[model samples]
Target chain A: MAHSPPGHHSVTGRPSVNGLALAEYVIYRGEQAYPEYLITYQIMRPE
Target chain B: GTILIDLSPDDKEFQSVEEEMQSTVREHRDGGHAGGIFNRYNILKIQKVCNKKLWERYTHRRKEVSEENHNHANERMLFHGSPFVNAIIHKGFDERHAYIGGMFGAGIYFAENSSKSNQYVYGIGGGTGCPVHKDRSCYICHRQLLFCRVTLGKSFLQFSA
Candidate 1:
């Protein structure tokens, strides 16, 4: 599960399993440079 | 998570930043290596010797431009490869600390008995590109710095100094 810091916008596009959400959050929070693309989604558990 | 806040080249802050950078470089080169290695008298003498050698081989090319009244050429030449060297040094020091921590955590006996003197070999190897050639350019040079920080964070530890 990803958590956004207080006073920041909740980024929406797609859920990611490989920490892309966290990376994006970092960029949004001004902690890192932003990546070119937003995450879409990932399968958490495949049957 | 090494965060290098490079504040160079911004007009309002450039002069102050340059002075700060020069001071930092002088402190590290003098205190970190030369000061620790030699006696007081010999330290001064050796620093002069090393500084002279560095000037002749490296700094001279840049300084010559300044002396020739080519200010823009001097600025470009002065920063030729210093950034890459600084980056490697920063990464190397971080790796050394990581190895020390891992070895320490493994226990005193294991740490004392271990014979891995070259554990930081990659960092040393990376230093080979220091004073990177002009064909390398500032962008590539800065990229090396960025890569060094990224690699250090990914491989060695998750935090930076």
Candidate 2:
């Protein structure tokens, strides 16, 4: 893995039941407003 | 009562309720010497303006009692109780959208029990009809119709209060 984005909550940072990490992922990406445009060019243009 | 006959077209007395009722009863019962009186009013002017089904039902009921020679008793029973009352309304997008609307009132009947006046129980409620048209036919195409049994006791009040 390259590295996680700043402020991305892992299980160690915050503990909760069921999809806590995904919930943090959503919250973290929500502030960005448009997470779709942040994909690496290789992944975005994947053939 | 005097039976006044006039061949003149301008006579106005014939228009009165007493004269009309007397004349109509004579015609239907065949003579003034008839045993019973028949009440006749302007049920419909242009008969075609009335609902066929409702008119048929009314006539059928009348015939059922009349043929059995129970017309007098039936009429008395109907008049003795609080009359069933109804009202009509028209609603539709086009012409010819008039119909009986609904009723909102109570009817009471009184009877003599052991020489004392007692009240008999009678109630009216519930209404059924389909909502038709856009509800804009109030002026150009509408009619209000009412149907009810007649009562002979003290008059009861009816209002929207």
Candidate 3:
């Protein structure tokens, strides 16, 4: 059910965002940044 | 039925999408229920190839609208955050699941701001965290937001209360 497509690879980056002065820092808020895990999948024609 | 094409972080299309998401997320920081969350963990190009007729219909509409509207169909890329990412990415949008009392009307709702759309994203893969809060311990491991391309030809603005 899950597979990679040809000529495509994983992407990663620093957590990028603009101003959002909040009290908490976490991965979701782009405060403590990291490369996001990503993948591509295809679905065959269904019945 | 659908092909999800992952974009590289350095790709122009990926950068464009990132800019769009950031512009809106930071535009109205106070408007969103959450302070803000730029965790667009993954961006995919959704291609629904199985529905030939639907694709044709959309292209036909776009062509007609552009031809009549001075060659400007007013197409826009907007956001639609949902808990049913699997359903949406696979089967396309269905109005049957639309929430009642939609401010405008009975149709798919999209936002220019990630904060506004983030309000709709809920836990899908059994994560126990909420997007609105800053709690690290209860963080939901898997959340999703969808930035979609919308065709908005000559349209109506609802300024009336």
Candidate 4:
């Protein structure tokens, strides 16, 4: 069974986050360093 | 069948995930097993200690099922062998819920258990080579937060305080 987890609804591939360090990094530095392969996916926390 | 949604704190299996998790930081025994890579894995400190052997056996079973595009050793090089870096902390969160997420593709994870047992954790998919069964995320086994997991994902895991 593909258990559907709770509290997960992403507008894009990037999910929401808590904490100061995590949110800021995702917002400021989420897309600057792309793996080239990962660009296809939505960068959820871009500046 | 038992209703786990409202389990009793005395149920044993549903004890404080916070206490059990923090207890790891106080625990001195690091298994004294591996030296470098393996030595750094904190099976006791994490929340899936019961599933500790799961990765130990899984890692050794690197007889990859003949991948057409993936090299068995190549995946292992990404710290797939270490549980600390790969664990999702709280795999299932209605009672004790958590998932892992990392924006950096170098296999790094960050986690914190709530005294409130919040329903937030890192997610694994796409970029992360870590193949996980969504249903089997919760380490409900052994009532311990120390388990081994496959690390194949981005860096900078998500969390809720």
Candidate 5:
């Protein structure tokens, strides 16, 4: 079964829990190498 | 103090990240929409560096939250889009500037769908659209979107009645 909200996907393997979905449109830093990142929002998970 | 590092265009990780972004946008694009501005763009990876003390504080908070949440915390890297890139890059996230107009009540809107964030970049629904074509700086060349590592602790589900 899918974990994320209807149309979204997960960046981490576990996309959703208790209906909240882990956001999909994520970008990574490091390896490529960098120092400043912008994180926008947050959603909590279930117990 | 925060340090900003730019990823080299040729980096393998950079290439992969860019490809991932493009594919995601394509998947979400409207069938009939061409996505002129959305279809093309380069991805820039700007890394953020914080001092050890600050880092420790963050991780400590993470651990504490995890403990309370049964060791998961549901942390994930997600995307956040906004026009105030400079403010966030230099200062940091302050909820005061958030608009209360999102599909969900306003706090900070993060998405797994790049197109959803792109709509904000173009000011599609929030306000008057950005005159991307008219302004030289508006070309889909250097755009800023935020990919954040978030700690989601015990989510409260919302449902439509």
Candidate 6:
């Protein structure tokens, strides 16, 4: 809820305490919303 | 440009296509730069997390070219225009995937592999992997794919005899 990141949704299907929603299959790795479908490695797994 | 040769089995010129297929497979196995016909079709199975032989058909099978409405192609078609379009399903064949053809190279998992999957790191279909445990070990997850894998055995092979 309040502890979750700002503007970020949780894949856990848990409505952010702040009511924000992240796609279930997506991870924030600090990035992409399932970029796997249309993205690249350098950014998906940035150092 | 017209394709220089016809690849019909009855046409005798098919041998050239077959020979080239062998070369493409060689290029694929050796990890060398690819040929056009193959870079388009065969190179999809470079490495798989599960069975390697199942996808080997990309390297085998008969190929011929004719202007007979182009005869055939696979689908849901990626690389729609480029010579490289193919599938990206995790464990199945005859997938509802994009089998790019026609013009742009922005088709299929090829561009996505280099661009998305291999690059930013992704797997086919943008789907998740088999569920695993905390220590990178889990059974029944990535290890078994009933719906898509070849392990399901043959429903189509009964009449082969």
Off by over 4 Å in 6: A1-47, B1-53, B62-90, B93-95, B99-109, B116-161
* Residue-level lDDT for B70 in candidate 1: 33
CAPRI category for model 3 = incorrect
Candidate 4 CAPRI grade: incorrect
TM-score of chain A, every prediction, order shown: 0.22, 0.16, 0.19, 0.15, 0.19, 0.19
In model 6, state the lDDT of residue B136: 16
User: Would you give the TM-score of chain B in model 4?
Assistant: 0.21
- Show how many residue pairs clash in every candidate, following the order shown: 0, 0, 0, 27, 10, 31
Please write out the lDDT profile of model 1 over residues B16-48, one tens digit for every residue: 423322222211222322111111110000000
Candidate 6 lDDT, B82-141, residue by residue in tens: 111123323323222322221211112222112111111112322232234321111122
User: Interface-residue RMSD per candidate?
Assistant: 23.3, 39.3, 17.2, 17.0, 12.5, 21.7
Q: Which tens-of-lDDT digit does each residue in B1-161 have in candidate 3?
A: 45555666777766766666555544333332332333333333422223444455456756665676588766655566666656665555555334333444334555555555555565322133354554322233344566654555545433321
DockQ of each: 0.02, 0.00, 0.03, 0.03, 0.09, 0.02
Chain B TM-score of candidate number 6: 0.21
Best by DockQ: 5
- How much TM-score does chain B earn in each model? 0.21, 0.22, 0.68, 0.21, 0.72, 0.21
Listing every candidate in turn, what is its Cα RMSD in Å to the true structure after a full C-alpha superposition? 22.8, 37.3, 14.9, 18.5, 10.4, 20.9
Q: Compared to the true structure, candidate 2 yields what TM-score?
A: 0.19
> Local distance difference test, per candidate?
0.20, 0.19, 0.42, 0.22, 0.45, 0.20
TM-score of 1: 0.19
- Considering TM-score, which of the candidate structures 1 and 6 is the better prediction for this target? 6
Per-residue lDDT for B1-161 in model 5, tens only? Answer: 65556556687755655555555553332431222333445544544434444455446656765786678656655556667656554555445335454434444555665545655653435234445443322433345666655555444444321
Which clashing pairs does model 5 show? Answer: A24-B112, A25-B112, A34-B47, A35-B5, A35-B47, A35-B48, A36-B47, A36-B48, A44-B152, A45-B155
Docking level of model 1: incorrect
Residue B6 in model 4: lDDT: 31
Ten-residue region with minimum lDDT total, candidate 5 chain B? B27-36
